[PDB]
Amino acid sequence: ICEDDWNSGERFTCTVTHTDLPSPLKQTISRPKGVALHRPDVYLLPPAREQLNLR
Amino acid sequence: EMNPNVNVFVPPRDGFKSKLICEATNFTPKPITVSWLKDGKLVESGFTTDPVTIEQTYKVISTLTISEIDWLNLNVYTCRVDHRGLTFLKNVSSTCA
Amino acid sequence: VAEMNPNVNVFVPPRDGFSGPAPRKSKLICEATNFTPKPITVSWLKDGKLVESGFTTDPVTIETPQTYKVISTLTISEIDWLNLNVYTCRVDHRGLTFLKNVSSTC
Numbered sequence: 001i002c003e004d005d006w007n008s009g010e011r012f013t014c015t016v017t018h019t020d021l022p023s024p025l026k027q028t029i030s031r032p033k034g035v036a037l038h039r040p041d042v043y044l045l046p047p048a049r050e051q052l053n054l055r
Numbered sequence: 056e057m058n059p060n061v062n063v064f065v066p067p068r069d070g071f072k073s074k075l076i077c078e079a080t081n082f083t084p085k086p087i088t089v090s091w092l093k094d095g096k097l098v099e100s101g102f103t104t105d106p107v108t109i110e111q112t113y114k115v116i117s118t119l120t121i122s123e124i125d126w127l128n129l130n131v132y133t134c135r136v137d138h139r140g141l142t143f144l145k146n147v148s149s150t151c152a
Numbered sequence: 153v154a155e156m157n158p159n160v161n162v163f164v165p166p167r168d169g170f171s172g173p174a175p176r177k178s179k180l181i182c183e184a185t186n187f188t189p190k191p192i193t194v195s196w197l198k199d200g201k202l203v204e205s206g207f208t209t210d211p212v213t214i215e216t217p218q219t220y221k222v223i224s225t226l227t228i229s230e231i232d233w234l235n236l237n238v239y240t241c242r243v244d245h246r247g248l249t250f251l252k253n254v255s256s257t258c
Contacts, residue, residue, distance in 0.1 A: 060171075062165070062169065062171075062178075062179070063166070063169070064163040064164065064165060064166075064169070064181060065163070065164065065165070065166040065169070066163070066164075067162060067163075067164050067254040067255075068164075068254075068255070068256060068257065068258050069253075069254065069255060069257070069258075071161065073161075074161070074163075076163055076181060078179075108210075116223075147166045147168070147169075148166070150166060150167040150256075150258075151258035
């Protein structure tokens with residue numbers, strides 16, 4: 001697929017035709033539009049002094 | 056003048072490509088035209104008509120080649136019978152699907 | 153000139169394949185194709201019981217190894233079909249027996 005198509009929220013369906021199941025299941029994959037963007041904050045937590053005892 | 060009976064056979068539920076048979080019986084006169092439809096679209100190839108035989112009544116049988124994938128997709132197959140200016144349509148589908 | 157195992161196929165009516173005055177009746181089609189030699193025996197079995205009436209077998213007709221086809225039709229009742237009865241088509245070819253089992257269960 002194209003990059004612009006994914007950002008447009010197009011509906012894509014994958015269907016599988018298997019002998020066991022007479023009804024092909026439908027799965028819908030689409031990017032949820034209308035969501036806000038936020039800057040992720042990366043925090044690093046060093047190990048505590050109570051963990052560095054058993055070596 | 057008797058209206059022809061339209062019957063369409065389906066593959067077994069537990070498995071069989073397969074074939075579709077449309078049979079017209081107890082009809083008069085001998086000439087009769089039988090065709091096939093797929094989701095309301097005309098079929099141009101993949102079907103054959105056997106010569107009309109005598110069962111006075113006549114019998115005509117037709118065979119349509121179908122694929123397993125199309126059958127599982129709930130495709131609609133219709134047998135069209137034309138006789139004495141009358142058109143008969145029969146719709147069939149998978150019972151388990 | 154050659155020996156090929158026959159192929160057995162059984163056709164069953166759909167859920168809306170019954171019509172006429174009650175009790176409704178339908179038909180079953182068993183066809184063997186691409187078999188050689190021409191002679192072949194077709195029999196119908198219903199829950200292990202041989203069917204001796206209500207069936208009509210069409211004459212063998214010609215469809216490079218020579219090929220032949222045979223069509224057999226057996227009349228069935230709606231009541232028997234609703235009782236989950238199993239219909240088996242018996243095909244005899246050169247001493248070999250091939251059985252196919254069909255049912256209304258999914």
